Amino acid sequence: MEQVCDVFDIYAICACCKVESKNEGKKNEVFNNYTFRGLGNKGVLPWKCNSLDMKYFCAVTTYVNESKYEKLKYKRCKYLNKETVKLQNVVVMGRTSWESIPKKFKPLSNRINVILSRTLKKEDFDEDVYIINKVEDLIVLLGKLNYYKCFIIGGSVVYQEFLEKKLIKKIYFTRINSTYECDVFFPEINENEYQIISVSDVYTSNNTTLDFIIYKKTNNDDEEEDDFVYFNFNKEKEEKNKNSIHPNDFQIYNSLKYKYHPEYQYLNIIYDIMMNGNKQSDRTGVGVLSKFGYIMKFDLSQYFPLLTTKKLFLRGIIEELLWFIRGETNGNTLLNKNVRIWEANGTREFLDNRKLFHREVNDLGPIYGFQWRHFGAEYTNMYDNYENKGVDQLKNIINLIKNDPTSRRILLCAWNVKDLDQMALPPCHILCQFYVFDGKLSCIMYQRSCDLGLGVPFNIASYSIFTHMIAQVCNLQPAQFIHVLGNAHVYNNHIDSLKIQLNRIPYPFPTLKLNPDIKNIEDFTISDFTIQNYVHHEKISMD
Amino acid sequence: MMEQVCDVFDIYAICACCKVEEVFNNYTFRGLGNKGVLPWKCNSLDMKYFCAVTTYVNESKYEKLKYKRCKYLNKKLQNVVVMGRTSWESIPKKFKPLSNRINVILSRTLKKEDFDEDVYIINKVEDLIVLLGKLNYYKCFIIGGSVVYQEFLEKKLIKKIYFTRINSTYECDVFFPEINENEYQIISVSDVYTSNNTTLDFIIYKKTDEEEDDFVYFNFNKEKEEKNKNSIHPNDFQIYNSLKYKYHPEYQYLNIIYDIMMNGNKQSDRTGVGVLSKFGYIMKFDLSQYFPLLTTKKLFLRGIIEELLWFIRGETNGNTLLNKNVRIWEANGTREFLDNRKLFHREVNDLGPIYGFQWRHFGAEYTNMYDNYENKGVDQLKNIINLIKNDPTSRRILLCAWNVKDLDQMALPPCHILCQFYVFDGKLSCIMYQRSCDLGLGVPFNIASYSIFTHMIAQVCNLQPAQFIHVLGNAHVYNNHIDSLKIQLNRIPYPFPTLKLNPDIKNIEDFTISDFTIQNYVHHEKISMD
Ligand SMILES: NC(=O)c1ccc[n+]([C@@H]2O[C@H](COP(=O)([O-])OP(=O)(O)OC[C@H]3O[C@@H](n4cnc5c(N)ncnc54)[C@H](OP(=O)(O)O)[C@@H]3O)[C@@H](O)[C@H]2O)c1
Ligand SMILES: Nc1nc(=O)c2c([nH]1)NCC(CNc1ccc(C(=O)N[C@@H](CCC(=O)O)C(=O)O)cc1)=N2
Ligand SMILES: O=c1ccn([C@H]2C[C@H](O)[C@@H](COP(=O)(O)O)O2)c(=O)[nH]1
Ligand SMILES: O=c1ccn([C@H]2C[C@H](O)[C@@H](COP(=O)(O)O)O2)c(=O)[nH]1
């Protein structure tokens, strides 16, 4: 049986930012969709203006397809039983919202402007600017008009008094990922009434990241299509797929239509290794599902790609980077700061199984740092002085970027074939290549071995931060970080956790902030790095 | 105004053509039959394609077609197949009549009484049309006989030709007619496949729901047309853009060219020519199905095979290649070139510690190209073969030419930085990372080289080759190549060739040039990238 919002095509469109608590978050803040609920402040927007949100609002509320109207006209008039009634959309708002708009571009261009109010009389306005007395009389006015879709463009009350009356088929919802002072807030959307079916790319505008999501009301030449089917004649269409994983499992992941959030590059790879991976044994003797050769790209000028579908920490991985940059190989330096990334690889037991019987505990051999600052020097022990020994690759790439930015030889390589056996383990992160165009730096990192569940989330972060570091000391803006995965594997003991993760919807990404005073690569310290607006799902223990 | 018959009754042709017992064109593939049977006897994948196409039906779409045909006449679902009598007689008895299809048979010498089978007999093309008028069916496929294909093409009764290119040569006595390019144009090209010891592909000649808004919304910030960079005209890629489906794996290469031309960044370069460049691509080629030698221009493999054998031997002496009339490394070994690299004490054509040396002796002190380096440095090639044999699930099977210490002593640094290998279920894949990529000239050869190398390693390790995966870093088109690449991007690829190795070679160091054969290379003409 047909419903009102379904017939008249009534949608809500809004934008919500984060709201400050006077109660400083003394415990770990808990995030959900309701985190983004701030609508207004003192009769205006909490962030004053956002030029990309404003472009999106206009674009959505004014777009019309005339060739799909008849079906809507036939739907509506037949619903009303009657036979008879430039195509434009209806925008419905409250009195305050209408007063909030500046007169210069009021009324709202190319739209049928309706205004809910009880002190407004039609006398003071016009015919094309409909005034309405109550919620009930909209449906009446929509029966007498030619319009494509009907958008409730807000007022806290208006949204409130439309959602509880179930008059909203979809909510077009912008997540503004920054905090402001707010006096009015969007209602709390009930997970049983609406659900997200799409998530956009992540964007930066007016000094904040944002994304656009779509809530959907829940249910509680032609013959160019055939040529397509012919080209698929050689597939294996079935019920059971390689690795015993079910339909139930990825319900929410598969229920989304559009998944353009860049976090899906990581999640889709996980999905693909789960659906199509090869069962293989491994060195650790745990078992993996693996595939070979993927690429991700992250636009560092729009966001910092810190995964939001679980909680990630960055002190440790920043310290590792600073340790690399110093050329250090001494695992004790990291352990004394309680960064234990390399602890297991520096034990007596581990070093002995590597046949490094004459190596001091936590002396990791000529690994990353040594290779970046001293490639080709003779490694002795972790306490020796190597000043001016070997090739200082880090310095060389920084000089190439500054003086010869179009070079195709700007590479930082860790995979020193001669020294491999002396390393506690060989590098997973083989090399970094750099590319500079128009004042912008991009970096490719080739990773030979990628633990999708535990390692890769951190690996993305390390090299994003490093790309910022290199860019800043060379007076460039960071553009793309490009992650190439060789042997890409999901450990079997991660499978259940990654199943939980794949059915979580990303939040818009945070931003990285470097102390702008730092201008040489060796001058960074742990307090020079700030992550802002990290909104994330709850922590997951992978193992 | 008024419809052609082929449109109203959806009359298509499906056929398969081999090469016939050198300049190549579409007419290269024209072998239809021999001694009343197929020139190749049998091809499983082609048969499967044939069955899939001629039996596939879309129930939802019929009522739209019923109206069309009923308006034109004023008025379980199956397709029709129409064949010549001789072709009917070549079908084995247990496959007559073709299952799940209405079978129609053209004949003058035989009549309904001469057939036991549920089939329509007609003695006139015109009668086929009358019959289609009376029947309920989805589409009508003319499945040939050469005599049948010819007359239907001449009468302009064919809306599309579904054409299989069987990329091998056989004895033939009957032939598909030469298609007129003025009347039919190719609109789609499939992936390339191997079946019954031949490659083949499938091409198509053509006669010359609420969510959809959400998609428009999420595209609200995409650019206009005119802002998308370079001086590139529509007319320049009209054939390239004419194609509906571009699934031939050569499009991985061609699409990258296209992308660099339309979206690339204008940059100066070490050479002074300047390029359009972009950063980070990936191509995948399935070596179990084809050898990915580009077909949209002519390439030779003798040189790059000799180069590869020279690498495997650990050589750094350019004279070895010049004596086999291979001049790939010539320019990088001249007095002048070595002087410009500050290598004043290097003998001419002594390329220094390049690829071969790093593969066999990484870390050894380089002296000159004549020295005996026995058991010095790390023999990486040997190690990766041992790892593949004895520890196939290792994630450390890498071969690296970027020896940071030695870079300055090389005539020039390597472009092919590394190879990583992967082993599953008896099958070997290879990723090669290329730091710098001359799309126009180098990339077609580099694809070939490493595909061959993957074959060689797979073989001496008793594996079958699987994927060559090519990763490009600085991917550039030289400006002096643009006009030649505009030409090539409008050529339609041909089914790829195959590569055969002497199967008696069991150690990587034992291959010689004659142990390599390229078969069935069909290609467009040579292009100077001038
Ligand atoms: N590679 C492929 O794709 C493919 C596809 C199909 C067939 N084939 C091969 O092609 C060969 C057979 O082809 P073909 O040209 O020799 O024979 P065909 O075209 O199958 O048959 C010719 C016969 O069909 C009947 N016919 C054709 N046009 C007619 C008309 N307008 N009116 C009445 N009858 C008509 C006549 O039969 P009567 O003599 O009884 O009058 C005529 O002799 C075989 O080798 C077969 O294997 C290859
Ligand atoms: N593309 C193409 N390939 C062909 O082999 C072919 C064609 N077109 N057009 C006409 C034709 C006529 N010759 C033949 C000979 C035998 C069968 C046959 O036995 N077909 C069965 C087997 C298919 C299967 O089991 O995969 C059929 O049901 O189609 C069909 C056509 N053969
Ligand atoms: O920064 C890191 C370090 C390690 N690994 C993973 C990949 C493999 O699971 C394992 C390294 O061991 P091998 O692949 O070298 O055996 O750790 C990462 O993903 N990222
Ligand atoms: O096998 C090769 C060797 C060279 N090049 C190209 C890429 C660059 O245009 C040039 C070397 O350039 P540099 O990056 O060294 O400047 O040669 C290839 O594409 N493939």
Automatic annotation (TrEMBL), chain A:
<feature type="binding site">
    <location>
        <position position="451"/>
    </location>
    <ligand>
        <name>dUMP</name>
    </ligand>
</feature>
<dbReference type="InterPro" id="IPR001796">
    <property type="entry name" value="DHFR_dom"/>
</dbReference>
<feature type="binding site">
    <location>
        <position position="44"/>
    </location>
    <ligand>
        <name>NADP(+)</name>
    </ligand>
</feature>
<dbReference type="InterPro" id="IPR045097">
    <property type="entry name" value="Thymidate_synth/dCMP_Mease"/>
</dbReference>
<dbReference type="InterPro" id="IPR036926">
    <property type="entry name" value="Thymidate_synth/dCMP_Mease_sf"/>
</dbReference>
<dbReference type="GO" id="GO:0032259">
    <property type="term" value="P:methylation"/>
</dbReference>
<feature type="binding site">
    <location>
        <position position="117"/>
    </location>
    <ligand>
        <name>NADP(+)</name>
    </ligand>
</feature>
<comment type="subunit">
    <text>Homodimer.</text>
</comment>
<dbReference type="GO" id="GO:0000166">
    <property type="term" value="F:nucleotide binding"/>
</dbReference>
<feature type="binding site">
    <location>
        <position position="459"/>
    </location>
    <ligand>
        <name>dUMP</name>
    </ligand>
</feature>
<protein>
    <recommendedName>
        <fullName>Bifunctional dihydrofolate reductase-thymidylate synthase</fullName>
    </recommendedName>
</protein>
<comment type="similarity">
    <text>In the N-terminal section; belongs to the dihydrofolate reductase family.</text>
</comment>
<feature type="active site">
    <location>
        <position position="428"/>
    </location>
</feature>
<dbReference type="InterPro" id="IPR024072">
    <property type="entry name" value="DHFR-like_dom_sf"/>
</dbReference>
<keyword id="KW-0511">Multifunctional enzyme</keyword>
<feature type="binding site">
    <location>
        <position position="117"/>
    </location>
    <ligand>
        <name>NADPH</name>
    </ligand>
</feature>
<dbReference type="InterPro" id="IPR000398">
    <property type="entry name" value="Thymidylate_synthase"/>
</dbReference>
<feature type="binding site">
    <location>
        <position position="118"/>
    </location>
    <ligand>
        <name>NADP(+)</name>
    </ligand>
</feature>
<dbReference type="InterPro" id="IPR012262">
    <property type="entry name" value="DHFR-TS"/>
</dbReference>
<dbReference type="GO" id="GO:0006231">
    <property type="term" value="P:dTMP biosynthetic process"/>
</dbReference>
<feature type="binding site">
    <location>
        <position position="158"/>
    </location>
    <ligand>
        <name>NADPH</name>
    </ligand>
</feature>
<feature type="binding site">
    <location>
        <position position="97"/>
    </location>
    <ligand>
        <name>NADP(+)</name>
    </ligand>
</feature>
<feature type="binding site">
    <location>
        <position position="15"/>
    </location>
    <ligand>
        <name>NADP(+)</name>
    </ligand>
</feature>
<keyword id="KW-0489">Methyltransferase</keyword>
<feature type="binding site">
    <location>
        <position position="119"/>
    </location>
    <ligand>
        <name>NADPH</name>
    </ligand>
</feature>
<feature type="binding site">
    <location>
        <position position="449"/>
    </location>
    <ligand>
        <name>dUMP</name>
    </ligand>
</feature>
<feature type="binding site">
    <location>
        <position position="44"/>
    </location>
    <ligand>
        <name>NADPH</name>
    </ligand>
</feature>
<feature type="binding site">
    <location>
        <position position="119"/>
    </location>
    <ligand>
        <name>NADP(+)</name>
    </ligand>
</feature>
<feature type="domain" description="DHFR">
    <location>
        <begin position="9"/>
        <end position="217"/>
    </location>
</feature>
<feature type="binding site">
    <location>
        <position position="491"/>
    </location>
    <ligand>
        <name>dUMP</name>
    </ligand>
</feature>
<feature type="binding site">
    <location>
        <position position="96"/>
    </location>
    <ligand>
        <name>NADPH</name>
    </ligand>
</feature>
<feature type="binding site">
    <location>
        <position position="159"/>
    </location>
    <ligand>
        <name>NADPH</name>
    </ligand>
</feature>
<keyword id="KW-0521">NADP</keyword>
<feature type="binding site">
    <location>
        <position position="159"/>
    </location>
    <ligand>
        <name>NADP(+)</name>
    </ligand>
</feature>
<feature type="binding site">
    <location>
        <position position="408"/>
    </location>
    <ligand>
        <name>dUMP</name>
    </ligand>
</feature>
<feature type="binding site">
    <location>
        <position position="156"/>
    </location>
    <ligand>
        <name>NADPH</name>
    </ligand>
</feature>
<keyword id="KW-0547">Nucleotide-binding</keyword>
<feature type="binding site">
    <location>
        <position position="158"/>
    </location>
    <ligand>
        <name>NADP(+)</name>
    </ligand>
</feature>
<feature type="binding site">
    <location>
        <position position="161"/>
    </location>
    <ligand>
        <name>NADPH</name>
    </ligand>
</feature>
<feature type="binding site">
    <location>
        <position position="95"/>
    </location>
    <ligand>
        <name>NADP(+)</name>
    </ligand>
</feature>
<feature type="binding site">
    <location>
        <position position="97"/>
    </location>
    <ligand>
        <name>NADPH</name>
    </ligand>
</feature>
<feature type="binding site">
    <location>
        <position position="39"/>
    </location>
    <ligand>
        <name>NADPH</name>
    </ligand>
</feature>
